[PDB]
Short mmCIF file of N, CA, C and O in Angstrom, two decimals:
data_model
loop_
_atom_site.label_atom_id
_atom_site.label_comp_id
_atom_site.label_asym_id
_atom_site.label_seq_id
_atom_site.Cartn_x
_atom_site.Cartn_y
_atom_site.Cartn_z
N UNK A 112 6.90 -20.52 6.42
CA UNK A 112 5.70 -19.75 5.46
C UNK A 112 4.99 -19.06 6.42
O UNK A 112 4.29 -18.23 5.38
N UNK A 113 4.44 -18.78 7.43
CA UNK A 113 3.36 -17.97 8.08
C UNK A 113 4.36 -16.56 7.95
O UNK A 113 3.48 -15.89 8.14
N UNK A 114 5.63 -16.38 8.37
CA UNK A 114 5.77 -15.08 7.86
C UNK A 114 6.39 -14.85 6.77
O UNK A 114 6.15 -13.54 6.71
N UNK A 115 6.54 -15.87 5.81
CA UNK A 115 6.16 -15.57 3.98
C UNK A 115 4.80 -14.43 4.08
O UNK A 115 4.92 -13.00 2.82
N UNK A 116 3.94 -14.74 4.17
CA UNK A 116 2.49 -13.65 3.92
C UNK A 116 2.05 -12.93 4.48
O UNK A 116 1.31 -11.52 4.60
N UNK A 117 2.52 -12.88 5.91
CA UNK A 117 3.27 -12.38 7.19
C UNK A 117 3.80 -10.56 6.67
O UNK A 117 4.02 -9.33 7.22
N UNK A 118 5.07 -10.76 5.84
CA UNK A 118 5.72 -10.17 5.75
C UNK A 118 5.66 -8.61 4.78
O UNK A 118 5.51 -7.91 4.24
N UNK A 119 4.02 -9.69 4.12
CA UNK A 119 3.39 -8.26 3.16
C UNK A 119 2.52 -7.66 4.04
O UNK A 119 2.55 -6.00 3.47
N UNK A 120 1.90 -7.60 5.42
CA UNK A 120 1.27 -6.95 5.81
C UNK A 120 1.97 -6.21 7.21
O UNK A 120 1.94 -5.40 7.57
N UNK A 121 3.48 -6.61 7.19
CA UNK A 121 4.55 -6.16 7.94
C UNK A 121 4.43 -4.70 7.87
O UNK A 121 5.18 -3.89 8.87
N UNK A 122 4.05 -4.38 6.79
CA UNK A 122 3.90 -2.76 5.77
C UNK A 122 5.28 -2.66 5.33
O UNK A 122 6.80 -2.24 5.63
N UNK A 123 4.98 -2.56 4.32
CA UNK A 123 6.13 -2.63 3.30
C UNK A 123 5.55 -2.31 1.78
O UNK A 123 5.48 -0.85 1.56
N UNK A 124 5.62 -3.50 1.00
CA UNK A 124 4.93 -3.41 -0.16
C UNK A 124 3.09 -2.60 -0.66
O UNK A 124 3.12 -2.22 -1.73
N UNK A 125 2.88 -2.44 0.36
CA UNK A 125 1.29 -1.76 0.21
C UNK A 125 1.98 -0.33 1.48
O UNK A 125 0.96 0.00 0.54
N UNK A 126 2.74 -0.15 1.16
CA UNK A 126 2.37 1.22 1.88
C UNK A 126 2.79 1.90 0.76
O UNK A 126 3.17 3.29 0.71
N UNK A 127 3.87 1.88 -0.30
CA UNK A 127 3.82 1.49 -1.27
C UNK A 127 2.96 2.89 -2.03
O UNK A 127 2.74 3.46 -2.48
N UNK A 128 1.63 2.11 -1.84
CA UNK A 128 -0.03 1.96 -2.42
C UNK A 128 -0.13 3.40 -1.82
O UNK A 128 -0.78 4.37 -2.43
N UNK A 129 0.08 3.39 -0.50
CA UNK A 129 -0.70 4.53 0.51
C UNK A 129 0.42 5.78 -0.45
O UNK A 129 -1.07 6.62 -0.46
N UNK A 130 1.24 5.36 -0.97
CA UNK A 130 1.59 7.23 -1.83
C UNK A 130 1.50 6.85 -3.49
O UNK A 130 1.33 8.36 -3.86
N UNK A 131 1.07 6.05 -4.04
CA UNK A 131 0.46 6.08 -4.84
C UNK A 131 -1.50 6.17 -5.38
O UNK A 131 -1.49 6.87 -5.74
N UNK A 132 -1.83 6.38 -3.84
CA UNK A 132 -3.41 6.90 -3.56
C UNK A 132 -3.29 8.51 -3.75
O UNK A 132 -3.96 8.54 -3.81
N UNK A 133 -2.53 8.79 -2.72
CA UNK A 133 -2.97 9.88 -2.42
C UNK A 133 -2.92 11.47 -3.49
O UNK A 133 -3.11 11.87 -3.37
N UNK A 134 -2.48 10.39 -4.69
CA UNK A 134 -2.30 11.40 -5.99
C UNK A 134 -3.06 11.50 -6.78
O UNK A 134 -3.64 11.74 -7.75
N UNK A 135 -4.10 10.05 -6.49
CA UNK A 135 -4.92 9.63 -7.58
C UNK A 135 -6.25 10.87 -6.59
O UNK A 135 -7.10 11.37 -7.92
N UNK A 136 -6.37 11.42 -5.70
CA UNK A 136 -7.11 11.63 -5.19
C UNK A 136 -7.04 13.14 -5.52
O UNK A 136 -7.99 14.17 -5.83
N UNK A 137 -5.69 13.70 -5.63
CA UNK A 137 -5.20 15.16 -6.27
C UNK A 137 -5.71 14.86 -7.83
O UNK A 137 -5.45 16.71 -8.09
N UNK A 138 -5.27 14.18 -8.64
CA UNK A 138 -6.23 14.01 -9.85
C UNK A 138 -7.02 14.31 -10.10
O UNK A 138 -7.51 14.63 -11.65
N UNK A 139 -7.84 13.34 -9.47
CA UNK A 139 -9.32 14.11 -9.70
C UNK A 139 -9.85 15.67 -9.46
O UNK A 139 -10.42 16.38 -10.17
N UNK A 140 -9.72 15.68 -8.57
CA UNK A 140 -9.81 17.43 -8.42
C UNK A 140 -9.84 18.41 -8.34
O UNK A 140 -8.18 17.89 -8.56
N UNK A 141 -9.62 19.85 -8.62
CA UNK A 141 -8.87 20.70 -9.25
C UNK A 141 -8.07 21.91 -8.51
O UNK A 141 -7.67 21.49 -7.67
#
């Protein structure tokens, strides 16, 4: 239970967003 929600912050499903955000700032600027 305690490790269930901790697995999310353990670095995985969120790190994915890290790669999704890098392209966001690139789409704005030219």
